[PDB]
Amino acid sequence: VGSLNCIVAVSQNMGIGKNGDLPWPPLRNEFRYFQRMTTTSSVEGKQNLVIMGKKTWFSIPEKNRPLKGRINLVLSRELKEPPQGAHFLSRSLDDALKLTEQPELANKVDMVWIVGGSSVYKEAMNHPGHLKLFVTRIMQDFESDTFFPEIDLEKYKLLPEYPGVLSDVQEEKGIKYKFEVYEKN
Numbered sequence: 662v663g664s665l666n667c668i669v670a671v672s673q674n675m676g677i678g679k680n681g682d683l684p685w686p687p688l689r690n691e692f693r694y695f696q697r698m699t700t701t702s703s704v705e706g707k708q709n710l711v712i713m714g715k716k717t718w719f720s721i722p723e724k725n726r727p728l729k730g731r732i733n734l735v736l737s738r739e740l741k742e743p744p745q746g747a748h749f750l751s752r753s754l755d756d757a758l759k760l761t762e763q764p765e766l767a768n769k770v771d772m773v774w775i776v777g778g779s780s781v782y783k784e785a786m787n788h789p790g791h792l793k794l795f796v797t798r799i800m801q802d803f804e805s806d807t808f809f810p811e812i813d814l815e816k817y818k819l820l821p822e823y824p825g826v827l828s829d830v831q832e833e834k835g836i837k838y839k840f841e842v843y844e845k846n
């Protein structure tokens with residue numbers, strides 16, 4: 662796999678989660694952005710793969726699992742088999758990427774998206790070679806118990822724009838946010 666994508670939404674205090682859910686009220690267009698970015702593939706015959714930790718999997722409402730139109734892979738050191746509805750299970754990020762090149766997934770996976778949580782992001786972001794980080798900056802503090810680190814501008818560049826990503830401040834339910842894209846090579 663020659664590129665990875667991470668996608669995350671963060672509060673001003675770097676929060677991503679609280680009590681097994683998001684720290685903020687539901688932002689429907691932000692969710693639709695997540696859906697669009699992770700699902701969209703114009704390569705006929707293939708789907709994108711989403712990789713996530715176990716707590717992130719159980720944080721998705723059961724009626725939306727597995728995430729439709731995507732191959733869903735969960736990371737766990739304890740399971741077993743994939744949780745009910747998930748397509749695949751791997752014991753590490755390295756194992757997950759290796760799995761995509763084996764016969765079952767060989768001609769089936771287009772883009773790989775890392776969708777959380779904290780550990781999965783940390784390792785992906787240190788992974789050699791090309792990485793893009795799609796970061797939604799929610800422009801408020803929210804009480805949180807799970808966090809995303811400050812991005813190191815030594816390794817990553819904030820792209821001034823990116824095709825298909827809106828550049829202006831967004832607002833839903835009185836909450837302002839903006840879509841950012843970072844890249845390292």
Ligand SMILES: NC(=O)C1=CN([C@@H]2O[C@H](COP(=O)(O)OP(=O)(O)OC[C@H]3O[C@@H](n4cnc5c(N)ncnc54)[C@H](OP(=O)(O)O)[C@@H]3O)[C@@H](O)[C@H]2O)C=CC1
Pocket residue numbers: 668669670671676677678679680681682683713714715716717718720736737738739740751752753754776777778779780781784807
């Ligand atoms: N705002 C946002 O963009 C997002 C928010 N969230 C929020 O974050 C919280 C969940 O994230 P977090 O608490 O970080 O948990 P994770 O989703 O990362 O789940 C943690 C568990 O996943 C497994 N795991 C994680 N990394 C690896 C690895 N590299 N290899 C093998 N197994 C791994 C382990 O399972 P085991 O113990 O079975 O080994 C671990 O205990 C929730 O509040 C959720 O709502 C989640 C994603 C994005």
Ligand SMILES: Nc1nc(=O)c2nc(CNc3ccc(C(=O)N[C@@H](CCC(=O)O)C(=O)O)cc3)cnc2[nH]1
Pocket residue numbers: 668669670689691692693694695696717720721722725728729776777797
């Ligand atoms: N940008 C971004 N925003 C997030 O909310 C987000 N959340 C997580 C993990 N949490 C979740 C929670 C629910 C769903 C979910 O049910 N998504 C469905 C419905 C989308 C919609 O309502 O429009 C999906 O089909 O993607 C996805 C990820 C990871 N990266 C993110 N990245």
Ligand SMILES: [K+]
Pocket residue numbers: 702703704705706707708771
């Ligand atoms: K496709």
